[PDB]
Design a protein around this ligand. Structure first.
Ligand code: NI
Length: 341
């Protein structure tokens, strides 16, 4: 049974609700982005209308085989009528194709569902500037002040400088980057660009990247591993055993690996600066964990909500424990008393 925080009141709509069977009353199923916890349940046998971005709809058709007649892609930043209700899709600053959804209810209530997002001051000049929001369905993944991490630009500067130094010292070093979902493509694209290389990968991952409308992608990626000195591997293989095994496969072309694991937050964030980050090393293998986040830090989240001034907040993450729920409710009240709404 579908939980209440996935239902939009006064509509026939649900958000990220595909694992509950046929939801009673639902006339349109929205999908905010192509991450498995959100699309869980979708397959080629799905026969209800799915509303989403163009990029999400490319992935639904090619990766999950959803039939075309049930995929309804909407352009961003554009007022659209769905089953009698005005909606707008906004860029969520998450992974490729990820959206927030503005719903203009027939009774005058306005609802924002963030999906998964990384709040940014640029959102204060989107179509959100133009009217009041009564209810906010909020990605609360990092809703606690211990969750700090650097800008995406600082993290990419660290990765590029680390990779270019290592490979210039040793032209026989291979760079490997972990992945297990879409998102975070800047990590491996920025490193391959500084090295003058395409990124090499499996046929399955190439297929996925080909759905993402990235400009000039054919110039940046390949399935020919031998021609590439940046390789992508499943995140589960980013360990000393998995990397040793991969180096064996490269036919004595390389004699060193430098590997990156883009994580979200880790408690090494509470002490160490990005500048001071060091790898784990065994022999000719070194592994860097880099804090590249596609979710809001605590401070970014607080700024967004204090700007928007919603009348009611419904969290969509960390909702399963009483302790998490009570923590989140306390911070919402602080924010509201501090700003005066
Ligand atoms: Ni996500």
């Amino acid at each position: 049974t579908c939980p209440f925080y996935k239902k939009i009141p006064g509509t026939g709509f649900t958000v990220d609700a595909f694992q509950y069977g046929v939801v009673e009353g639902c006339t349109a199923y929205f999908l905010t982005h192509f991450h498995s916890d959100h699309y869980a349940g979708l397959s080629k046998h799905f026969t209800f209308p799915v509303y989403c971005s163009e990029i999400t709809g490319n992935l639904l058709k090619n990766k999950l085989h959803v039939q075309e007649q049930y995929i309804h892609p909407l352009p961003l930043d554009t007022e659209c009528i769905v089953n009698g209700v005005k909606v707008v899709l906004l860029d969520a600053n998450h992974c490729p194709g990820a959206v927030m959804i503005l719903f203009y209810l027939p009774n005058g209530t306005v609802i924002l569902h963030t999906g998964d997002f990384r709040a940014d001051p640029s959102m204060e000049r989107s179509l959100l500037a133009d009217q009041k929001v009564h209810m906010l369905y909020l990605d609360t993944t990092y809703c606690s002040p211990e969750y700090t991490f650097p800008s995406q630009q600082e993290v990419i500067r660290f990765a590029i400088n680390t990779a270019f130094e290592a490979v210039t010292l040793n032209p026989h070093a291979l760079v490997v980057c972990g992945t297990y979902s879409i998102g975070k493509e800047k990590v491996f694209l920025a490193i391959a660009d500084v090295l003058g290389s395409k990124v090499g990968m499996s046929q399955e991952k190439y297929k996925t990247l080909q759905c993402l409308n990235i400009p000039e992608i054919n110039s940046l990626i390949t399935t020919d591993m031998c021609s590439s000195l940046v390789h992508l591997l499943p995140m589960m293989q980013i360990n000393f055993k998995g990397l040793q095994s991969h180096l064996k496969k490269c036919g004595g072309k390389y004699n060193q690996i430098l590997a990156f694991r883009p994580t979200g937050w880790t408690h090494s964030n509470k002490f160490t600066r990005i500048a001071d980050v060091i790898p784990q090393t065994k022999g000719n293998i070194s592994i860097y964990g880099i804090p590249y986040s596609e979710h809001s830090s605590y401070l970014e989240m607080k700024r967004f909500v204090q700007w928007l001034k919603p009348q009611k907040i419904i969290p969509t993450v960390n909702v399963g424990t009483w302790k998490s729920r009570s923590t989140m409710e306390k911070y919402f009240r602080e924010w509201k008393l501090e700003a005066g709404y």
